[PDB]
């Protein structure tokens, strides 16, 4: 066991120790669809249902979500990891993907392990990220719930029960 | 694939599909040590280092967190379920666990994959949560950082990459 202040390596590994989910977000951006991926996602609240994200202000496509009326959040299965990259920074994005949208205009990502399609509701600064609350509007939920796409200590995997 | 609108079993199940860690939250509370285990932990801001955590407004121990100044988040090894049971609602919280304080004193419970002790930086309310931001002061780690205790869709479980 070893301590330190934050001041870089080791802070971003310890940081990775929290083991999480995978999700892109996506919304209608000035010129086409953006979407963005990050596991800084949280569910927050059962009533009123709302959710969290984070998404960083040194992306180029953070005003556009910072400005969005709404944005969906995909939570992505371990057969996904194709769509995670196309969201990471340099990825292809929507190249080659069919544009389909929900009633609200977001541009989705069919056959994700849950989709949240979410009305901004609140927005807070928050060092190098911004932090986005948002209630959810719609539910679309596919497959079976226990085989999600995981990133813990920097590597991709699965959850084994 | 189907769709429906929050409105409450399927909401819950659809949270669930989104993998995490599992964290025990600790404070200094006005009579002895406090934990709450929440799953509602993101990773922030590198920049300054900021992290987040979700208390429940329906526990008794809402206000502690609230008015708290420093409180540390410890992320959990597979290992550690009993640990996670103890500050889950009616365990034994603290009961038989040796008194450890940090040097803000806050309680502490050695032997984490991870623990951020952090100073509140900011709060703000969301439905039937809160959403604590804090400042990490300082950062201790123990062990392997690619064992975590991870919940997902309901379940108990590891990380296998």
Same mark, same amino acid.
């Given at each position: 066991?070893?301590?330190? #202040?934050?001041?870089? $390596?080791?802070? !971003?590994?310890?940081? *990775? $120790?929290? &083991? %999480?989910?995978?999700?892109?977000?996506?919304?209608? *951006?000035?010129? *086409?669809?953006? *979407?963005? %991926?990050?596991?800084?996602?949280?569910?927050?609240?059962? +009533?009123?249902?709302?959710?969290?994200?984070?998404?960083? !202000?040194?992306?180029? !496509? #953070?005003?556009?979500?910072? +400005? &969005?009326?709404?944005?969906?959040? #995909?939570?992505?299965?371990? +057969?996904? /990891? +194709? %769509?995670? /990259? !196309?969201f990471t920074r340099g990825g292809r994005q929507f190249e080659g993907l069919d544009t389909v949208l929900t009633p609200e205009g977001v541009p989705v990502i069919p056959g994700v392990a849950a989709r949240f399609d979410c009305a901004a509701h609140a927005a807070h600064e928050a060092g190098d990220h911004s932090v986005l609350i948002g209630r959810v509007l719609r539910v679309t939920v596919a497959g079976p719930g226990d085989h999600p796409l995981v990133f813990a200590a920097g590597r991709f995997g699965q959850f084994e029960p």
């Open positions: 066991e070893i301590t330190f #202040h934050p001041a870089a $390596r080791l802070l !971003r590994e310890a940081l *990775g $120790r929290f &083991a %999480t989910g995978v999700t892109v977000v996506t919304t209608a *951006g000035p010129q *086409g669809p953006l *979407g963005m %991926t990050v596991n800084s996602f949280s569910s927050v609240s059962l +009533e009123p249902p709302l959710v969290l994200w984070c998404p960083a !202000r040194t992306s180029a !496509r #953070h005003a556009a979500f910072a +400005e &969005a009326g709404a944005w969906s959040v #995909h939570v992505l299965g371990s +057969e996904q /990891l +194709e %769509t995670c /990259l !196309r």
